[PDB]
From Swiss-Prot, chain A:
Effect in UniProt of substituting R231Q: In a breast cancer sample; somatic mutation
Domains: entry comment: The FYVE-type zinc finger mediates binding to phosphatidylinositol 3-phosphate and recruitment to the midbody during cytokinesis.
Name of the featured protein: Zinc finger FYVE domain-containing protein 26
Chain ranges of zinc fingers (FYVE-type): 146-193
Complexes and interactors: Interacts with AP5Z1, AP5B1, AP5S1 and SPG11. Interacts with TTC19 and KIF13A.
Binding-site list for Zn(2+) 2: C169, C172, C189, C192
UniProt binding sites for Zn(2+) 1: C152, C155, C177, C180
Disease cited in the entry: Spastic paraplegia 15, autosomal recessive: A form of spastic paraplegia, a neurodegenerative disorder characterized by a slow, gradual, progressive weakness and spasticity of the lower limbs. Rate of progression and the severity of symptoms are quite variable. Initial symptoms may include difficulty with balance, weakness and stiffness in the legs, muscle spasms, and dragging the toes when walking. In some forms of the disorder, bladder symptoms (such as incontinence) may appear, or the weakness and stiffness may spread to other parts of the body.
Function text: Phosphatidylinositol 3-phosphate-binding protein required for the abscission step in cytokinesis: recruited to the midbody during cytokinesis and acts as a regulator of abscission. May also be required for efficient homologous recombination DNA double-strand break repair.
Subcellular location: Cytoplasm, Cytoskeleton, Microtubule organizing center, Centrosome; Midbody
Expression sites (tissue/organ): Strongest expression in the adrenal gland, bone marrow, adult brain, fetal brain, lung, placenta, prostate, skeletal muscle, testis, thymus, and retina. Intermediate levels are detected in other structures, including the spinal cord.
Species for this entry: Homo sapiens
Curated annotation (Swiss-Prot), chain B:
Residues of the full protein shown: 1767 to 2248 of 2443
Protein name per the record: Spatacsin
Pathology noted in the entry: Spastic paraplegia 11, autosomal recessive: A form of spastic paraplegia, a neurodegenerative disorder characterized by a slow, gradual, progressive weakness and spasticity of the lower limbs. Rate of progression and the severity of symptoms are quite variable. Initial symptoms may include difficulty with balance, weakness and stiffness in the legs, muscle spasms, and dragging the toes when walking. In some forms of the disorder, bladder symptoms (such as incontinence) may appear, or the weakness and stiffness may spread to other parts of the body. Amyotrophic lateral sclerosis 5, juvenile: A form of amyotrophic lateral sclerosis, a neurodegenerative disorder affecting upper motor neurons in the brain and lower motor neurons in the brain stem and spinal cord, resulting in fatal paralysis. Sensory abnormalities are absent. The pathologic hallmarks of the disease include pallor of the corticospinal tract due to loss of motor neurons, presence of ubiquitin-positive inclusions within surviving motor neurons, and deposition of pathologic aggregates.
Tissue: Expressed in all structures of brain, with a high expression in cerebellum. Expressed in cortical projection neurons.
UniProt gene name: SPG11
Self-association and partners: Interacts with AP5Z1, AP5B1, AP5S1 and ZFYVE26.
Purpose of the protein: May play a role in neurite plasticity by maintaining cytoskeleton stability and regulating synaptic vesicle transport.
Compartment annotation: Cytoplasm, Cytosol; Nucleus; Cell projection, Axon; Cell projection, Dendrite
Length: 261, 410
């Protein structure tokens, strides 16, 4: 079917137009080298860079567990987004291999995803990571304030504390206790009334990046693990000290467990 | 890729060859020899291998025969045939290092018989593989191998520059056999998880360290270890079905774990296995949850733990009316700073004066919390205050005196 091209322009045009149409795993894995076969320089564009963008992204998605490979095709061709997604699922240990692969595979990989962008990714991740809380579904403004109801808006038994924390319900927006609102779908309980899923698109990408609040409260372990990845070691330590100073002032507040704090 | 392609086809050959009913094992013996030689050549010159393994029969069953581990299964040291190259045997030892790390006992011997390579490491390896049964006399072994169960587990145990895990499992089997009292064959057939669980029920005085050592020796999987640990804890509690004394008996079990967080998860999961009316043992069981989750501080875990504690108070303890057990639990709250569910209950449960129980403050924190409760939860009854800040009392009396003095001046 390829060799039966009508005109020489047609072969290149089809080869180019094909890839963007929601490709498949093997579909890409073949059509890539297919366009490679006889095109060389016929349309450089951002085309060569885009080809590279999977030329290593395959190997990237190709270091995980067998069952882990399944969701890896969800964004297996946006490697910059791929590293972040790898960070997202709290799946630290898997990152280390990806980091080593990127560093060994940077080798002139003119893909924009320069290691400095990686450092930015990691820094932002850590800042989010050790970050310490210190009739219709309601909107963001309609969400009940954290300090509004000293007792839970639903349970009304456990006071708001670092250990005795709460959440915002999805039904009326009240500060309903997860114990009182342990369900997922007037001020009614969740029953009475989750890792990243990345895509090629940036809209839901921004939505999730503004949403994926790592529900696990701030346990240094995750922070140390994440930080141990990037290369700006002295800068890493400066970031650590700065975050420490950020934490410091919270102590005098009376809604935290001072000992563990 | 010519060597790589050759390996691919070579491995492909056996994929079909196994399907045959009567496998000419000798015919494929050359095939296996060629496959290993191709691996060595690739190393010397140093998805594809994915599909190769996907149809690989390197672990071909009959290829892994027991007679491949016979008394002279390897060529002797003097049988070091000079058919090797300068770096061929070196890379061969390099891979054989992963092999001894791989631990396929039969496969390595098959390769050696095929390759005719005299790695004395393999020599001791073949010594130990059958020495597990001690099937040959000590003098009867090789001139380098001819020279008290653990006598074999430590005569040259460290001499294994690589593959020490072999001697480690060897000593593990030696200790297991000496303890349980069974032959090498009977012991070697039991499953690793089953044998570990059998060790778990063991209550011998000093078997704890040896058993933990053997658990390291097996090296099977952490999660199975955690499951076994939770089961052992539950079994000991069911058997039990001073208070400060058994704390160590409890903890030293959890000590067996690698990283306590998975153990905490397992214990939390096993907590649901409480028996009908299981209250006294389950109290300690729930108590252990905080002692686990606190030292590492997984905040969500502790949160669910606190939920569990309130649930134990309400669903069971409230109908149980076990005043002493509840008191001990409240002492063990850890986050006793957050004990509002029974804070006024103790005063309502006639514990207000009973809060003055002696010998209940080994660290003195119970009386301090009593003072905190007198300040916050129940202010006004100075009698329980004296039973349990005198500066607060002084300030209050001074304020009353000042108010009385100013009332006249008004």
């Amino acid at each position: 079917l390829l060799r039966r091209i009508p005109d020489p322009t047609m072969c290149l045009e089809v080869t180019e137009q094909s890839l963007d149409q929601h490709t498949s795993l093997a579909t890409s894995h073949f059509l890539a080298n297919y366009l490679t076969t006889h095109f060389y320089g016929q349309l450089t564009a951002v085309r060569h860079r885009e080809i590279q963008a999977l030329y290593v992204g395959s190997k990237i998605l190709l270091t995980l567990p067998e069952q882990h490979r399944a969701s890896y095709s969800h964004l297996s061709s946006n490697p910059l987004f791929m590293l972040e997604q790898l960070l997202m699922n709290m799946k630290v240990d898997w990152a280390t291999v990806a980091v080593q692969t990127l560093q060994q595979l940077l080798v002139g990989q003119e893909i924009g995803f320069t290691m400095d962008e990686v450092d930015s990714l990691l820094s932002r991740y850590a800042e989010k990571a050790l970050d310490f809380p210190y009739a219709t579904p309601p909107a963001r403004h309609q969400w009940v304030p954290d300090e509004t109801e000293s007792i839970c808006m639903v349970c009304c038994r456990e006071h708001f504390t670092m250990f005795n924390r709460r959440h915002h319900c999805r039904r009326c927006g009240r500060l309903v206790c997860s114990s009182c609102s342990t369900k997922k779908m007037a001020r009614v309980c969740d029953q009475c009334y989750v890792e990243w899923i990345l895509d090629l698109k940036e809209e839901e990408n921004e939505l999730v990046r503004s949403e994926f609040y790592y529900e696990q409260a701030p346990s240094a372990s995750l922070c140390i693990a994440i930080l141990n990845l990037h290369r700006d070691s002295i800068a890493c330590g400066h970031q650590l000290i700065e975050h420490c100073c950020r934490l410091s002032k919270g102590l005098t507040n009376p809604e935290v467990d001072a000992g563990l704090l | 890729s010519s060597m790589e392609e050759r390996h691919l086809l070579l491995t492909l050959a056996g994929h079909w060859l196994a399907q045959e009913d009567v496998v000419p094992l000798d015919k494929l013996e050359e095939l296996e020899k060629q496959i290993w030689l191709c691996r060595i050549t690739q190393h010397t010159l140093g998805s594809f291998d994915s599909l190769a393994s996907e149809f690989s029969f390197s672990k071909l069953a009959a290829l892994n025969t027991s007679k491949y581990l016979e008394l002279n299964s390897l060529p002797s040291k003097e049988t070091c045939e000079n058919r090797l190259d300068w770096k061929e045997q070196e890379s061969l030892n390099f891979l054989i290092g992963r092999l001894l790390d791989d631990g396929c006992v039969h496969e390595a011997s098959r390769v050696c018989r095929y390759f005719h390579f005299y790695n004395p490491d393999v020599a001791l390896v073949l010594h130990c593989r059958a020495l597990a049964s001690g099937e040959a006399s000590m003098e009867d072994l090789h001139p380098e191998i001819h020279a008290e169960v653990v006598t074999n587990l430590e005569v040259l145990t460290s001499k294994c520059l690589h593959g020490k895990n072999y001697c480690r499992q060897v000593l593990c089997l030696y200790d297991l056999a000496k303890e349980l009292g069974c032959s090498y064959t009977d012991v070697a057939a039991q499953d690793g998880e089953a044998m570990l669980r059998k060790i778990l029920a063991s209550q011998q005085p000093d078997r704890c360290k040896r058993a933990q050592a053997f658990i390291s020796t097996q090296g099977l999987k952490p999660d199975t270890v955690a499951e076994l640990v939770a089961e052992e804890v539950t079994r000991e509690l069911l058997t039990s079905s001073n208070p400060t004394e058994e704390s160590q008996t409890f903890l030293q079990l959890t000590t067996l774990c690698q990283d306590r967080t998975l153990v905490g998860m397992k214990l939390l999961d096993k907590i649901s296995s409480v028996p009908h009316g299981e209250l006294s043992c389950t109290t300690e069981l729930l108590i252990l949850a905080h002692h686990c989750f606190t030292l590492t501080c997984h905040m969500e875990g502790i949160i669910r733990v606190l939920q569990a504690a309130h649930m134990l108070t309400d669903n069971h303890l409230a109908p149980s009316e076990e005043y002493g057990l509840v008191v001990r639990l409240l002492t063990g709250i850890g986050r006793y700073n957050e004990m509002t569910y029974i804070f006024d209950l103790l005063h309502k449960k006639h514990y207000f004066e009973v809060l003055m129980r002696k010998k209940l403050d080994p660290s003195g924190t119970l009386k301090t919390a009593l003072l905190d409760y007198i300040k916050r939860c129940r202010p006004g009854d100075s009698e329980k205050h004296n039973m349990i800040m005198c500066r607060e009392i002084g300030e209050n009396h001074e304020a009353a005196a000042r108010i009385q003095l100013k009332l006249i001046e008004s």
